Amino acid sequence: QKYASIVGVDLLEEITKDHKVLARQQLQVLARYLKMDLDNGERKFLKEKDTVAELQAQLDYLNAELGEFFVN
Amino acid sequence: RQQLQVLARYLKMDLDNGERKFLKEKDTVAELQAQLDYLNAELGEFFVN
Amino acid sequence: QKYASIVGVDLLEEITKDHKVLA
Amino acid sequence: RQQLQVLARYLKMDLDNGERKFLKEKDTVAELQAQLDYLNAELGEFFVN
Amino acid sequence: YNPEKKEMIQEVIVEEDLEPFEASKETAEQFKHQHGDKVDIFEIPETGE
């Protein structure tokens, strides 16, 4: 209502959530019991996405220096 | 293990999505490392450094 | 609508399900 | 144990509420037993009986 | 400052993983830099948080 003054502007399914919270938490404890790592996948991925950006930088550099015509 | 699987299936949760995306990036690296190893073959270490 | 032509005829609780599936 | 905890947390259920209220009453006893042990000191057993 | 209630902080080791919380990008990298292995930080792709 103080943004309203400065600019000039005048003016059911939270139960299905609370179950899925419980299921989420129940899953976590079974994982922890199984010595299972539900992020290991995404971690390794993020670390490879970095080595790509790094190699794409090295390869974009050499196109800058030699040119498209010479690399093709 | 089995109990976990059914909770996942209930949560529309994908316990491989991580490893899938990874394997698909490990391929784009091998591919770019091939392109970059090629140019070292052609120009030489001395010229690329 | 092709049955309609031949004979001459003219024209909430799926969440409780998804739990019972899990159980 | 862990599975129990999460069901409790889901049920808005307090597995200590009992023991908390108890510890807080054990204090009001010690307090009243102090007041009552005092008056036996002052008047004596013979006079309070 | 209430000398009856003088605020200190004790270092403890997390014996079991905490419930995730949302930070900015900047602040999460600050947690990762400090903790290394012992923290996990993941972009929430809708918000950016």
From Swiss-Prot, chain A:
Domain of life: Eukaryota
Post-translational modification summary for this protein: 4'-phosphopantetheine is transferred from CoA to a specific serine of the Acyl carrier domain by the C-terminal PPT domain. This modification is essential for activity because fatty acids are bound in thioester linkage to the sulfhydryl of the prosthetic group.
TM stretches of this protein: none
Subunit-structure text: [Alpha(6)beta(6)] hexamers of two multifunctional subunits (alpha and beta).
Family of this protein: Belongs to the thiolase-like superfamily. Fungal fatty acid synthetase subunit alpha family.
General remark: Present with 17000 molecules/cell in log phase SD medium.
Task performed by this protein: Fatty acid synthetase catalyzes the formation of long-chain fatty acids from acetyl-CoA, malonyl-CoA and NADPH. The alpha subunit contains domains for: acyl carrier protein, 3-oxoacyl-[acyl-carrier-protein] reductase, and 3-oxoacyl-[acyl-carrier-protein] synthase. This subunit coordinates the binding of the six beta subunits to the enzyme complex.
Record-given protein name: Fatty acid synthase subunit alpha
Organism: Saccharomyces cerevisiae (strain ATCC 204508 / S288c) (Baker's yeast)
Lineage: Eukaryota, Fungi, Dikarya, Ascomycota, Saccharomycotina
From Swiss-Prot, chain C:
Protein name per Swiss-Prot or TrEMBL: Fatty acid synthase subunit alpha
Note, other: Present with 17000 molecules/cell in log phase SD medium.
Subunit composition and interactions: [Alpha(6)beta(6)] hexamers of two multifunctional subunits (alpha and beta).
The protein's role, per its UniProt record: Fatty acid synthetase catalyzes the formation of long-chain fatty acids from acetyl-CoA, malonyl-CoA and NADPH. The alpha subunit contains domains for: acyl carrier protein, 3-oxoacyl-[acyl-carrier-protein] reductase, and 3-oxoacyl-[acyl-carrier-protein] synthase. This subunit coordinates the binding of the six beta subunits to the enzyme complex.
Organism: Saccharomyces cerevisiae (strain ATCC 204508 / S288c) (Baker's yeast)
Top-rank lineage group of the source organism: Eukaryota
PTM comment: 4'-phosphopantetheine is transferred from CoA to a specific serine of the Acyl carrier domain by the C-terminal PPT domain. This modification is essential for activity because fatty acids are bound in thioester linkage to the sulfhydryl of the prosthetic group.
Coiled-coil ranges (or none): none
Family of this protein: Belongs to the thiolase-like superfamily. Fungal fatty acid synthetase subunit alpha family.
